[PDB]
């Protein structure tokens, strides 16, 4: 008794006003947007989309292979180009709440951007106890605009890599291969330089608990580096100073 009408349950399907809001926006950000909407909506001709399966690992599977499969799962959700934000992410939520969201993201299987990927990367690597995970944020400048981008830094047995999502191949995944944290960060700085972006700020998070019931928040801004005020060698030493206060804390 009691037909389900669970207004507190999230997930697709979404209401008709929200649905229109996306298509209205699509006509605005695409040259022939109205024709895109007309052709996609109602067409009985749309491909089926499979739900990506979250990888499962044998206990003997090495951590670098697990990282590649985790990054690949994150990629097959696809980068969100639709104009919409599909998930509301409050960065000050307790980790346990952020992990509920990550699980929901795996069940809804919608496109994502950089922050969803960071959340998913933590969720999907909590089960790897020898892997340290910590967010890395970049603020860049280009052509009259400031841009913000975040990835999940990782450390496996002394080597630094990264999981993430970006429109650019060189601004996300990095295999755990760098010997130092400054090499990982300078690698992202070079990739930004390739596209004439000026790196203004690097924010280094603290390492994130592996306990998915943890009520602690993520420390997103444990170290903040003003790269232009630092120069070059003070930058490298401040990065190595955070990494040591990361391995001792």
């Amino acid at each position: 008794g009691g037909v389900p009408f669970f207004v507190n349950r999230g997930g697709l399907p979404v209401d008709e006003a929200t649905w229109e809001r996306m298509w209205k926006h699509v006509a605005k950000i695409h040259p022939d947007g109205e024709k895109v909407a007309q052709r996609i909506r109602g067409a009985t001709d749309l491909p089926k989309i499979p739900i990506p399966s979250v990888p499962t690992f044998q206990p003997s599977t090495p951590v670098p292979e697990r990282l590649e499969a985790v990054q690949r799962y994150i990629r097959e959700l696809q980068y969100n180009h639709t104009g919409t934000q599909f998930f509301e992410i409050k960065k000050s939520r307790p980790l346990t709440g952020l992990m509920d969201l990550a699980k929901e993201m795996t069940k809804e299987a919608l496109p994502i951007k950089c922050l969803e990927a960071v959340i998913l990367g933590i969720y999907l690597t909590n089960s790897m106890p020898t892997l340290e995970r910590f967010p890395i944020s970049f603020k860049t400048y280009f052509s009259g605009n400031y841009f913000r981008h975040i990835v999940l830094g990782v450390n496996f047995a002394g080597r630094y890599g990264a999981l993430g999502m970006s429109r650019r191949e060189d601004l996300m995944y990095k295999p755990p291969a760098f010997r130092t944290l400054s090499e990982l960060v300078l690698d992202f700085e070079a990739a930004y330089g390739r596209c004439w972006h000026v790196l203004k700020k690097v924010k280094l998070g603290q390492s994130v608990s592996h306990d998915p019931h943890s009520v602690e928040q993520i420390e997103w801004k444990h170290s903040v580096l003003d790269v232009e005020r630092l120069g070059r060698d003070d930058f490298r030493k401040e990065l190595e100073r955070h990494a040591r206060d990361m391995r001792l804390k």
């Binding site: 697709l12 996609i40 909506r41 180009h81």
Partner: peptide
């Protein structure tokens, strides 16, 4: 389930839309 059908329709339309927007973005 008519809700399940609406769900699958919306998600299918979301990814078709994302396909078109990626093609626009990647060619620029």
């Amino acid at each position: 389930s008519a809700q399940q059908e609406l769900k699958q329709r919306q998600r299918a339309e979301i990814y078709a839309l994302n396909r078109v927007m990626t093609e626009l973005e990647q060619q620029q």
